[PDB]
């Protein structure tokens, strides 16, 4: 129903830029942003197998590892109409864990870059909270965004983006239980609408 | 010396597969000159950190790894006399572009009158494991080594609470013959 499970819920995610004068008037531009009773639509995981990095830690093996209900697809309409480039994430749990979070970027389904961080829990009002705030976006991505934003046509941006995906894998560090696996696929939004997203479940 | 400084020493390093097989192992010095490897790392690149100082913290290790052979694991273990919290960062680089960065932290455990920092059984990142299988199916040691001339790992341990760098190891890689096993050579990075 949302992006997450009973063990680990994604509270918030966002990738952004603050211009170098934000020390005078603060502003931040959101490339993409998720903030968090229908059930969610489904998408068949094999239909995107080729879009993620096969052999090991790619989609098929991860799904085979399960649990099957931990897998969500997120379709992003990015706002490229806008410095410090950042990513922030916030998850929450009933149990106290140490999370490992991996972010794999893949071009044409080949694992281009991978960031991996650990995050330990901080108590809160009835919940454990895990905050990975203001991760500085790696400059592969900032460069790709700059090159991408100067293309002359939306449809060209979207054909480029059809090869660019991101796989996020959150696991328990101690036990290696997979908690959350998210495939992201990307399209650019028209000027006037901001960023927007549609979350699906990955079934088989 | 060994691999370390007065504030922090490497006691154990091992990269292994269990079905245990050890690709590389250190258990516990001539100067190599840092510019000689500048073209091997990004430019987050080694010159940045070396300028940051302290240059007595920077080391180079050359591994001759053993690929003759699951769970793919990395275990490091450090030592200190001050109670610290380490941030250990690995960066795997291929052809100078940084293709993975893995970031962990370990807080000090008291033991035998010293502090041990044990980062044991990190799942080897998936890039490295795919790389290892591909590398292993090659038919000649010289082909492995040609491949491996473009692959390097860079480790920066820093004090978490202060951001001081404490340690900085560049790793370079070749394969050894089926007879000889793993071997390695630590070097001071100077300039
Ligand atoms: O910025 C991101 C990122 C992560 C997940 C996600 F769903 C995104 F949309 C992300 N950003 C992003 C990607 C494409 C466009 I067009 C706009 C965006 F805002 N990340 C993952 C990150 O950590 C990478 C992983 C690989 C190495 C480190 N940088 C930074
Ligand atoms: C640099 C390309 C790969 C080198 C191939 C040699 C085989 C042994 C690998 C040792 C890696 C040790 C550090 C890895 C950190 C991680 O777990 O990502």
Output the DSSP codes for A139-194: HHHHHHHHHHHT-S-HHHHHHHHTTEEEEEEEEETTT--EEEEEEEEEEEPPSSS-
**Residue A76 CB partners (closer than 8 Å, separation 6+):** A32, A184, A185, A186, A187, A195, A196, A197
Task: Tell the residue number behind the tokens 């931040």, with chain if given.
Answer: A28
CA angle B111, B113, B119 (to 5 degrees): 35
Instruction: State how far the Cα of B168 lies from the Cα of B189, in Å rounded to an integer.
Output: 9
**Residue B165 CB partners (closer than 8 Å, separation 6+):** B49, B52, B53, B54, B57, B156, B157, B158
Backbone angles phi, psi at B158, to 5 degrees: -130, 155
Nearest to B167 by CA among B61, B74, B73: B61
Structure-block tokens of residue A47? 């239909």
Instruction: State how far the Cα of A203 lies from the Cα of A47, in Å rounded to an integer.
Output: 10
Which atom in ligand 1 lies closest to the alpha carbon of residue A161?
16
In order of A15, A81, A117, B59, the CA distances from B50 in angstroms are 31, 38, 24, 10
Instruction: State how far the Cα of B12 lies from the Cα of B3, in Å rounded to an integer.
Output: 10
Which atom in ligand 2 lies closest to the alpha carbon of residue A116?
18
Distance A184 CA to ligand 1 centre (A): 9
Instruction: State how far the Cα of B142 lies from the Cα of A70, in Å rounded to an integer.
Output: 44
Q: Which H helix or E strand runs over B48?
A: helix B46-52
Ramachandran bin of B113, using left for φ above 0, alpha for ψ from -120 to 50, beta for the remaining angles = left
Specify whether the CB–CB gap between A12 and A59 falls below 8 A: no
Pick the CATH number of A9-203 from 2.30.29.30, 2.30.110.10, 3.30.70.3290, 2.70.50.80: 2.70.50.80
Residues with CB under 6 A from ligand 1: A 15, 31-32, 76, 78, 87, 103, 105, 113-115, 135, 137-138, 141, 145, 166, 168, 184, 186
A138: which DSSP letter? P
Nearest to B95 by CA among B136, B53, B51, B131: B131
By Cβ distance, the residue of B97, B102, B130 closest to A56 is B130
Instruction: State how far the Cα of A58 lies from the Cα of A111, in Å rounded to an integer.
Output: 9
Instruction: State how far the Cα of A114 lies from the Cα of A75, in Å rounded to an integer.
Output: 20
**Residue A125 CB partners (closer than 8 Å, separation 6+):** none
B113: which DSSP letter? T
Q: Which H helix or E strand runs over A87?
A: strand A84-93
- Rg (C-alpha) for chain A, rounded Å, is 17
| Helix, strand or coil, per DSSP, at residue B28 | coil
Residue ranges of domains in chain A: 9-203
Instruction: Give the number of other CB atoms < 10 A from CB of residue A118.
Output: 17
Nearest to A200 by CA among A59, A52, A41: A41
* First-to-last C-alpha distance (Å) of chain B: 18
Specify whether the CB–CB gap between A131 and A122 falls below 8 A: yes
In order of A119, A166, B110, B112, the CA distances from B84 in angstroms are 18, 35, 11, 16
Looking at domain B9-190, its CATH architecture is Distorted Sandwich (2.70)
Instruction: State how far the Cα of A32 lies from the Cα of B59, in Å rounded to an integer.
Output: 40
Instruction: State how far the Cα of A143 lies from the Cα of A107, in Å rounded to an integer.
Output: 14
| Helix axis angle, A139-149 to A154-161, nearest 10° | 150
B chain contacts of residue A55, beta-carbon cutoff 8 Å: 126, 130, 133
Structure-block tokens of residue A118? 């650990």
Instruction: State how far the Cα of A43 lies from the Cα of A52, in Å rounded to an integer.
Output: 15
Distance B172 CA to ligand 2 centre (A): 10
Q: What residues form DSSP beta bridges with A38?
A: none
By Cβ distance, the residue of B99, B103, B130 closest to A117 is B103
Q: B29 and chain A: CB distance < 8 Å anywhere?
A: no
Structure-block tokens of residue A80? 């490229």
Burial of A6 (C-beta count, 10 Å sphere; 0-12/13-18/19+): exposed
How many Cβ pairs closer than 8 A exist between chain A and B? 45
Instruction: State how far the Cα of B10 lies from the Cα of B24, in Å rounded to an integer.
Output: 14
> SS3 sequence, B121-152?
EEECCHHHHHHHHHHHCCCCHHHHHHHHCCEE
**Residue B73 CB partners (closer than 8 Å, separation 6+):** B15, B16, B17, B18, B121, B122, B123, B124
> SS3 sequence, A16-66?
EEECCCCCCCCCCEEEEEEECCCCCCEEEHHHHHHHCCCCCCCHHHHHHHC
**Ligand number, closest to the Cα atom of B131:** 2
Instruction: State how far the Cα of B78 lies from the Cα of B116, in Å rounded to an integer.
Output: 6
Specify whether the CB–CB gap between B173 and B148 falls below 8 A: yes
**Ligand number, closest to the Cα atom of B130:** 2
Specify whether the CB–CB gap between A5 and A92 falls below 8 A: no
**Residue A84 CB partners (closer than 8 Å, separation 6+):** A17, A18, A20, A22, A136
Chosen from B94, B126, B131 to mutate, greatest number of chain A CBs within 10 A? B126
Which atom in ligand 2 lies closest to the alpha carbon of residue B93?
1
In order of A58, A94, A106, B51, the CA distances from A113 in angstroms are 13, 31, 7, 26
């Amino acid at each position: 129903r949302g992006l997450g499970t009973a063990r680990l819920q994604l509270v918030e995610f966002s990738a952004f830029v603050e211009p170098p004068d934000a020390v005078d008037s603060y502003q931040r531009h959101l490339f993409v942003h998720i903030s968090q009773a229908p059930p969610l639509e489904s998408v068949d995981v094999r239909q995107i197998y080729d879009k993620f990095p096969e052999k090991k830690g790619g989609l098929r093996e991860l799904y085979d590892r399960g649990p099957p209900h931990a897998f969500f697809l997120v379709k992003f309409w990015a706002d490229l109409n806008w410095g410090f480039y950042g990513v922030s994430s916030q998850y929450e749990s009933l149990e106290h864990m140490t999370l490992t979070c991996s972010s794999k970027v893949c071009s044409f389904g080949k694992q281009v870059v991978e960031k991996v961080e650990t995050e330990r829990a901080q108590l809160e009002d009835g919940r454990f909270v895990y905050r990975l705030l203001r991760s500085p976006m790696c400059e592969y991505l900032v460069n790709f965004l700059h090159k991408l934003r100067q293309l002359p046509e939306r449809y060209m941006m979207n054909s480029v983006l059809e090869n660019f995906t991101i796989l996020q894998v959150v696991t328990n560090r101690d036990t290696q239980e997979l908690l959350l696996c998210t495939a992201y696929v990307f399209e650019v939004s028209t000027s006037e609408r901001g960023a927007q997203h549609h979350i699906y479940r990955l079934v088989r």
